[PDB]
Write a protein that binds this ligand. Structure first.
Ligand SMILES: *[C@@H]1O[C@H](CO)[C@@H](O[C@@H]2O[C@H](CO)[C@@H](O[C@@H]3O[C@H](CO[C@H]4O[C@H](CO)[C@@H](O)[C@H](O)[C@@H]4O)[C@@H](O)[C@H](O[C@H]4O[C@H](CO)[C@@H](O)[C@H](O)[C@@H]4O)[C@@H]3O)[C@H](O)[C@H]2NC(C)=O)[C@H](O)[C@H]1NC(C)=O
Ligand code: NAG
Ligand code: NAG
Ligand code: NAG
Ligand code: NAG
Ligand code: NAG
Ligand code: NAG
Ligand code: NAG
Ligand code: NAG
Ligand code: NAG
Ligand code: NAG
Ligand code: NAG
Lengths: 220, 251, 213, 146, 213, 220, 213, 51, 236
């Protein structure tokens, strides 16, 4: 069966090189063109270029010619795209895709590239449940994951053991250039004194893991 | 809808780009006109045109900065009423982000009763006939909103004579109707394919009167037309119509 | 190069209703192709060669058009149809995509539940104060959040973030975060989040006094 | 909850919009009219039209927000009025879940003797629906009490 | 790719009345098949090959149609027929079902009996107060419940749940649950449930005063 | 007689895989296609795919491709379905079924698959009859079953002896992510002082059974 | 100034097949309109305002498009649909039509019946000889007719005429007229018409010998 | 019954065209086969298909 | 029903105008190719290309087609007629059958009209002897591409396996091999008759569920015959 297997996510300093790969299987490598597509947080799909694996013949979107380079390795049935001088503008998801005729019939799973010159771990602060976050017997509580760079962070609750209303809001770009995110959960207000709520924050770029216990405020 | 319109008084036309073609191409319909009351609270409120238009969804919309609108009275009249509506910013998308099309409207141009209006609009810059054009006859005293205007009321727009007309003989029609406080003189007319009979009535009281019209033809199913001679309307007062029936009407 | 203009950019339709979206090419092409993408995953071939259904696409989908004018139609909206649809051409180099139609699920109005959070003492000990206002499980997306500090309306010191439509009830949730220096937070007392939404007859306010339990 | 109608008076367009010059298919019977005694306890109660219409069960009902009804009486003279009935909620199913199709009725337009009445109705957003009836005279068992 | 559209999605019929439901295929099929399903059991083959009755299925049922349009007809509704009916085709891959017609029993109007329940003392120990209003054995299903606390209209703090038609008398019952903090519950005295239903000439109100056993 | 007997229910953490079985008997296994059908609670029937036991050939609804795998074992006259990476949207009844032409003539009894990240037994509170305002004829009483996960709970009355007049409502998902329901019964008001009414609540996912006696509140 | 290009100029469609014909405008127009014309009568308004059907037009017809690209579609070809379709614009002066798509109906192949007719004696007396070969009720329209006079192939002295498709059986008929002077005609004996057509495996020849009845 | 059939031996496609790799939709039932005795009342007769 | 084509050979303008180093847009589909078995029987058939093209310039007099195997050969197809573009309801389509197809080869085909990479071009890589069309190639058939032995292998005792298979008319010698984690048995078989024969192979270990491999030694394939596989199973 046809499969296009892309390499894993990459955190890379701007100015360095990176080469992401597309491992194809289930068909005759040389019969089908390989395309590459960029998708920013703007959600639009931008064609980068395509390559005929037979002879390596290529055509590019001219906004990418000389920024990206496409190659093939027939022996491994693998397609490659190399950014030789990465800039901050190149952080995005990158897809490979196979076409016959004008349409793409199989897609790779996507490769996230993050261009960062430095990393910064987040501070994790509690959003403590109170009567002003309670309604209909439901208490809201959460974790504010503040001032990290670059994306992404993941947030779980009670190590995946928590069944509840979960809202993890998309990160927001602060005017400092650092990101901030809130993860909130809704729970029975009657549970706030017997059940404990811990948010598990992971920031892979900085190798930061933080577990933060969230409890209601009480006066001294 | 990010771009908005600020409209102003530039002439800058010629009543010739409106009559560039004697016949205007019949599919220039992105331009609509509807009359609106200036004041809701008022019955004799002034009536304005609400001229609305939709913009083409194509790449040339990026080159658009103003729309010009001219209204012409056409009654051996000339134009001299043009407005120029400047768009406040450039158009980034060929449609609104959640909008069938880019739509704008301008309210202005006081409307007269029973008047024919030619309205043409042209985008700036860009062919050099009207980009959009519409013909428009304003409503008269029979329209549901215009009937309460003072000139219509005083011409009998709200007169309810409740005409009953019965074929009495082979050559007579009996016409009953309720008079108006607006006048004392009336003319009753019976018409099929031509006028077949006329009678004049003088009645000073507010009463339900009766008049015999002698007819020269077949009256069953003909129209009865009541002309009142109210002040301010002379011989151009609002006519009331009915239809002649077989009486008795029961078995 | 063929630019593909998609309309409308965003739309919502109730389950079972008919949906049309259009793709207009800047010059004539031989075929248009359509991809469906749900958030966070790869596009899937959806309609190809203008009117053919990819393997697996229900026949409630149809595509038609020719030259520069194309459309995708859903005869009856289903909940799983919620997605972004991109049209696409390669009759000319470069290969191009359209700007996308984001199709969301319409549902009945639902008013937000509003919650407010003071800054934690941990954040204060670090020098900054974030006050968080939460709007939970509301529909439609449009909502106005106004911060008041000691009844003074704020502006320019808050940022909003909104979730995608919930998988079960199709609602949105929104967080609004007001950020102040520790100095400014400790100078004022009453912090209020004022929420305007279609599902509320009058704006709802949630507030706290600094230092209350 | 289920949608009901809130009806009010409307100025409406000129009665030319009612002149069907193409024939509508005769088995489109979605609009009905009958006369009812307004007050049953009275000997001479006003006689009203009970105008009923059925909403077709397809895609477009979910976009429907109002139905417009105009009545023209032709006897010894014409009469002409219009109402707009707004639907109170949006339509969730293309038929009513405790009945069949969606049917609504408006009672109004007092009926005069010996008059032929033309009734047309159209949905908003868009005569699509039409029905006429000639009212009886003083020999009819209901009108004889006038 | 063939999709099957069933109409109506939900309908009610009195015993003895004629019932029709339709199944429309996005394109032509060789046969349509119908399954009956009652709550809590497997679907059963009912009509197959468009017009054949499975063994034992009452002959008041019939199927007909061809091309893309098919129907199931009950000459005379019986109470044992209340069920969901699905159509189904396998003239092309994938095998597909229609979305189903749920057929319920129409009966005479019956007004609800209304009951209101204060929160138990056991629950109040936990900090939360659930106030329950019960509408019992009413018909038709449509009913409105409004909560009032010290005559103030509530909104956003209640959830409703409705049973399926009772197997014996064909009525519905409804619960409305108003949930408050203990703090807010102990602040007010009069808790009222106001019920609107076609079988009541004026809304019925049931109330209790907090702590008045 | 033809019978299709399916394996028993499974409660599973989100992300796990499961394989359920369908044991056929009473006919020649290889002569008839076996189908699999998903039904979420209260909703529509979705075909997953089918398998020819003669040659092992399969076809899938593409919404399930990759997620589901069909197999048979001729020696046992058994069909199998493997569903991978379960999400909460996969909680449903799953049927196997037999066809010869295009219709299904025999169905299995169904297999419930439930995705739960945790389980939680309910609290059961009394809905105490308004003995304060007795008579008028019938009194209502009940049990409020709050804050459990996942579905379902079972509620009987008086160890199964009281069925008449009992209404157990559909569960509602609270904004806390937990479920709640009420079960009520209507009885003659004069029975409040003579009869005993106990609601027996069973929540199999958490092995919690709760019996709660519902009594008129102290009136004098 | 705007002109309209229609494609294809001529096409034949199998009964039951989907038909599309396109109209391309030299620059953008607000609407397109379509007229049907059957041989020997006036064009009739068919689809107007791009997608509205005139009264009586089968709902198997639809129109769509925008900008510069439009099309007319028949979901399933019927014999009654065979006609010439013109698109038309009046977004600019002059009012213009496209050149039309002539749509014919496909049927099964049928070989012609061939007949040859000698010149009459009345005509020869005037000095000219017309020899007529008739190909009757064949399909498809393409056919080759070769005249041979004492086995000498003719060229430049014959004209063909072809009927329109028969309304009832959808076939064509064709005449080929070989014209000679009386002088040349009376020099030869064997006048032959040889027909090549898809429905004949081998060419058919019809002959007469001059002056033999 | 106006059209009748005249049948003969014909070249057909390679027998791989009959190897469907999916499941055949169960309602594609236009083609039926049953066996018939070539000579009845006679014992060891060839058995034919009636397609 | 259209103008006809008469095709013949002609030299070609060297294999540089076809295989450029840029991509041609994928929706330029005026040139189509498919591989076809020319002979209708089940014996050895030549495998050829069916090259089709669609005909917006009005008239024309010839279309040139070149095929490159990685070989280089071109055809020039003259039209005997022209019509001053599309008379039938389809487009205007022609096809040429020719160019024998070799195993496992990449094919570049380009075409251009006379008078007038190129807009008419199609590429495809041919499969091998397991392909449903190419298995009918003579070299594949002679390697056993059409052999259907229908192997049944049955465990008789703890040290015996019964292997049944149908022989091929292409040869008389076969080697039956039984393998689990190692080869546990072998038999070289001679069989002159076309039948479903049976052979006992002596096994040294547990033979249940092992692979059985049948290697035919047809004189034309040497040691490169297509091998057939089955599995040892229990007996009824
Ligand atoms: C104008 O015309 C319309 C119809 O075109 C009339 O509407 C009908 O009104 C009558 C009563 O006036 C209704 O009859 C009632 O039916 C109820 C059942 O409702 C269901 O079933 C009917 C079909 O029979 C559906 O139309 C309906 O939507 C529901 O699906 C009965 O239960 C009623 O009795 C109830 O009311 C009385 C008090 O009013 C109680 O005492 C009873 O115990 C019980 O609660 C009654 O039988 C009929 O349903 C209406 N039909 C429609 C289509 O709306 C208008 O009345 C008429 N206007 C005027 C002014 O007369
Ligand atoms: C619109 O722009 C024109 C030209 O730039 C100018 O003359 C006119 O005053 C402007 N009108 C308004 C209302 O801005
Ligand atoms: C308006 O009137 C002119 C003059 O008769 C005519 O040419 C033009 O087509 C009319 N407009 C429309 C939209 O028909
Ligand atoms: C003018 O008409 C347009 C079109 O309906 C409308 O949207 C707009 O509100 C109108 N202008 C008013 C009411 O001032
Ligand atoms: C008109 O007058 C007739 C006769 O007097 C009366 O029966 C009828 O009710 C009147 N109608 C109106 C509309 O006033
Ligand atoms: C119906 O809606 C229209 C438009 O919103 C409004 O003008 C009218 O007053 C409404 N009528 C009623 C009876 O609510
Ligand atoms: C059937 O028709 C084909 C094509 O015309 C022909 O080749 C074949 O001989 C015919 N078969 C019979 C039995 O006549
Ligand atoms: C017979 O089996 C073959 C191979 O699986 C399949 O292609 C064909 O459709 C089957 N036919 C029936 C009637 O099951
Ligand atoms: C095609 O035409 C050319 C030039 O007229 C000629 O040289 C060539 O031989 C022709 N080819 C065939 C196959 O007739
Ligand atoms: C054929 O291969 C050539 C050379 O690599 C390439 O230019 C062309 O794109 C290929 N054909 C197609 C249809 O992709
Ligand atoms: C060659 O291909 C075309 C296009 O599919 C087809 O119509 C034609 O019949 C084929 N010819 C042969 C001999 O396969
Ligand atoms: C092999 O053939 C023999 C002899 O006919 C038979 O007894 C045996 O059952 C067959 N075994 C298998 C596995 O086919």
């Amino acid at each position: 069966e046809v499969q296009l297997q892309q390499s894993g996510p990459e955190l890379v300093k701007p100015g360095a090189s990176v080469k992401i790969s597309c491992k194809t299987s289930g068909y005759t490598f040389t019969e089908y063109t390989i395309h590459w597509v960029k998708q920013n947080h703007g959600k639009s799909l931008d064609w980068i270029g395509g390559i005929n694996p037979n002879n390596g013949g290529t055509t590019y979107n001219q906004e990418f010619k000389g920024k990206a380079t496409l190659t093939v390795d027939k022996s491994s049935s693998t397609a490659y795209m190399e950014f030789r001088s990465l800039t901050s503008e190149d952080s995005a998801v990158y897809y490979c895709a196979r076409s016959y005729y004008g349409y793409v019939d199989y897609w790779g799973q996507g490769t996230t590239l993050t261009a960062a010159a430095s990393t910064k771990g987040p501070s994790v602060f509690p959003l403590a449940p109170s009567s002003k976050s309670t309604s209909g017997g439901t208490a809201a509580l959460g974790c504010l994951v503040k001032d990290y760079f670059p994306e992404p962070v993941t947030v779980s609750w009670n190590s995946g053991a928590l069944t509840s209303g979960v809202h993890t809001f998309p990160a927001v770009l602060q005017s400092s250039g650092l990101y901030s995110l809130s993860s909130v959960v809704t729970v029975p207000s009657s549970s706030l004194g017997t059940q404990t709520y811990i948010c598990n924050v992971n920031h892979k770029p900085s190798n930061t893991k933080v577990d933060k216990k969230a409890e209601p405020k009480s006066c001294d | 809808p990010e771009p908005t319109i600020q409209c102003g008084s530039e002439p800058g036309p010629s009543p010739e780009w409106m009559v560039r073609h004697t016949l205007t191409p019949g599919d220039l319909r992105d331009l609509r006109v509807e009359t609106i009351k200036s004041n809701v609270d008022l019955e004799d409120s002034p009536i304005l045109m609400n001229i609305s238009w939709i913009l083409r969804a194509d790449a040339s919309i990026r080159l658009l900065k103003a729309t010009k609108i001219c209204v012409m009275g056409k009654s051996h009249f000339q134009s001299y009423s043009c407005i120029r509506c400047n768009y406040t910013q450039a158009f980034q998308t060929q449609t609104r982000p959640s909008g069938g099309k880019w739509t704008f409207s301008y309210v202005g141009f006081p409307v007269e009763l029973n008047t024919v209006y030619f309205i043409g609009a042209h985008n700036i810059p860009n062919e050099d006939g009207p980009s959009m054009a519409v013909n428009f006859t304003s409503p008269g005293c029979l329209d549901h909103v215009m009937k309460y205007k003072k000139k219509c009321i005083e011409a009998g727009s709200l007169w309810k004579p409740n005409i009953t007309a019965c074929k009495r003989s082979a050559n007579t029609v009996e016409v009953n109707f309720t008079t108006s406080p607006l006048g004392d003189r009336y003319m009753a007319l019976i018409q099929s394919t031509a006028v077949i009979g006329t009678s004049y009535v003088s009645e000073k009281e507010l009463t339900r009167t009766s008049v015999v019209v002698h007819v020269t033809g077949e009256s069953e199913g003909a129209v009865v037309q009541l002309t009142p001679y109210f002040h301010t309307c002379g011989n151009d007062c609002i006519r009331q119509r009915g239809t002649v029936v077989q009486c008795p009407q029961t078995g | 190069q063929i630019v593909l203009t998609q309309s409308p950019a965003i739309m919502s339709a109730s389950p079972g209703e008919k949906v049309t979206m259009t793709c207009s090419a800047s010059s004539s092409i031989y075929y248009i192709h359509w991809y469906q993408q749900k958030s966070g995953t790869s596009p899937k071939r959806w309609i190809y060669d203008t009117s053919k259904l990819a393997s697996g696409v229900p026949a409630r989908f149809s595509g038609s058009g020719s030259g520069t004018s194309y459309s995708l139609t859903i005869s009856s909206m289903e909940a799983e149809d919620a997605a972004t649809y991109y049209c696409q051409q390669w009759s000319s180099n470069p290969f191009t995509f359209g700007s996308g139609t984001k199709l969301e699920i319409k549902r009945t109005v639902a008013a937000p539940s509003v919650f407010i959070f003071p800054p934690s003492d941990e954040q204060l000990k670090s020098g900054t104060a974030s006050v968080v206002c939460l709007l939970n499980n509301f529909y439609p997306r449009e909502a106005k959040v106004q911060w008041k500090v000691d009844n003074a309306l704020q502006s320019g010191n808050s940022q909003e973030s909104v979730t995608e439509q919930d998988s079960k009830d199709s609602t949105y949730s929104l967080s609004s975060t007001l950020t102040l220096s520790k100095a400014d937070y400790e100078k004022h007392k009453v912090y209020a989040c004022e929420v305007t939404h279609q599902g509320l007859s009058s704006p709802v306010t949630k507030s706290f006094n600094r230092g209350e339990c």
